[PDB]
Amino acid sequence: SVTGRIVAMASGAGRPVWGPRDTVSLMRTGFAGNPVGFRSVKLIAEATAAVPLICPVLDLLRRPNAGQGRAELFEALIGQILLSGNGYLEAVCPEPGVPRELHVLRSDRMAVVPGADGWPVGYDYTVGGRKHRFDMTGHPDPICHIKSFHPTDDHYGLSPMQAAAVALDVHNAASAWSKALLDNAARPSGAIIYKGADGQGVLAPEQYERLIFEMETHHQGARNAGRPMLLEGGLDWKPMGFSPSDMEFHETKAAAAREIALAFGVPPMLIGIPGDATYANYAEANRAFYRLTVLPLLTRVSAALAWWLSGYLGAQIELKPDLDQVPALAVERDQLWARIGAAGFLSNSEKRVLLGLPPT
Template structure:
């Protein structure tokens, strides 16, 4: 039985149509070794995605904001469709990505796609179609529910998607995957990608521990206020267990917490109050937290200056940091994912097309692009075709002169 997502229209149980492909016998020389290592068993992710998401996204403001900045900027980047001959103003692929499915807009779809990559290192896209040709809808599948099934040659032969005890298998037929698996580079995993959260796991622990420490200070009048010292009376050298327990309970009930801040303490005979201040190590604790926050931001490719984190001197101003954010993080991410999507979807339409970001419409890169256009336009030794190629444009249409 075919597993249907809640919002999906009822579809046929037949597999998706795919273009005819020539059988090939080529294979990697290392494929057998990979297959032997996996032995045909399920290849499980090395990290618990759910735990990392709770720690680094749901429970950490720096991780949350860094992820939001990347996925919002990447999803908003304009995309164009072109082939070797022209750039299209109207195309089935443009219509598909402008409304991937009935439940998601273009922005929602791509935010979720890039979010999966940021949080788990993997993203899975399913194409749904009732007829041959371009897919009618695109759906995202949650990475924490997906399991890759390696085949005898080491490559994935199926993808198992499990929800509420029900499992649906997406088979890879005729050398083509039923779903598109987009992933980050992982040097030690053949099947799953590396999430930025994994690289920032230690910094997340440090930052979260520092936040809990600060919360503990607030719960205790926001400072290590002091100590009650028992001087002893009537020959009694120390407090009995009952006396110590009663004193601790009274201090906790009457003098700890924000509502009791500054409340005067009445001491019984034999008790003396010794005030305490911050030690040098306590004073360095906040700096440790700030350093951990910068490391979290850097793991996601976000300049700390854009998050308002102190101590970042890598860029002279906000505009320069924002330009570096787009050039070094957003554009490479969108370019890679757009290339993977276009290569995969091209097979359904039997047409080689290219999906790429339109950098001329990115305001953060406007000055940089303007300088590039001026340099290329002033190069008299280049033909029009060469200039267009340098600017990422297709060649001139047939019949137009190439000067």
């Protein structure tokens, strides 16, 4: 905070700081463009919305606004964090405490203002040429700004799609390689070469319609596969091939489809990409998914809702994921109940306090 004043002047106080320009184009080319970048965010954002929470405040979260439910809110919230590294939540307060409206402001059209002491004073929702200038020079601070970790930038997040932005363009263009190869390719199944007495000679349109009708009827198609095809003088049939037949950038697409899944943190088994068996039997890969890239993400966002929404209340509230009755963690729950349940030496109430039960 003491050094906060020094970085603020360099950027320029009172003026909007934009950060990354090409953020909106990674969405259309990397999330609406390829299925791997599409499925990876949809797999996470529909997983963090499904996790229950532990606190009143959750009555706001259950019904944030019209037409945007509890689970639909976090899909919009985490879906901006995975896409552009930043999450925004406007609170509309007709009432003084616990404001009854939440709105995920998209992070394409939002810009920060550094202000005096380096910590932000303005946020600017910029649609068309129109700005809004939300104000942070107050106590309730009407927008929570959830940052992904960015080491070099002081105001935004890193957005894992930016780290995979080369592997998206490999997977977008290798998939479009095979598309435009199926659309721009002339393979013939042969060529009836007609030289003539000279090195060059055309055949007359009388002879040419004769050549079609014996080729149309008697030689093409499945039903004429293999006629013995008499070739008189001058004529010759050179059959062409198609030498790379399968596998046009097949492994570099399948390797880039795994590096996209690597950056968002989904395992290759969940998304459905082919590859070597790393995880075994989905009791691991679903448990690894909710432990390395979902529950760390959800306990970081819920820790920002636990502090931003407590600024509207008087008492501070904690708000964490449940990490109980989330059915992907049952292999960590069998393993912990059967450990203490088999420990017969310590008594009955001495293990209800370990497994989390109210003792009797």
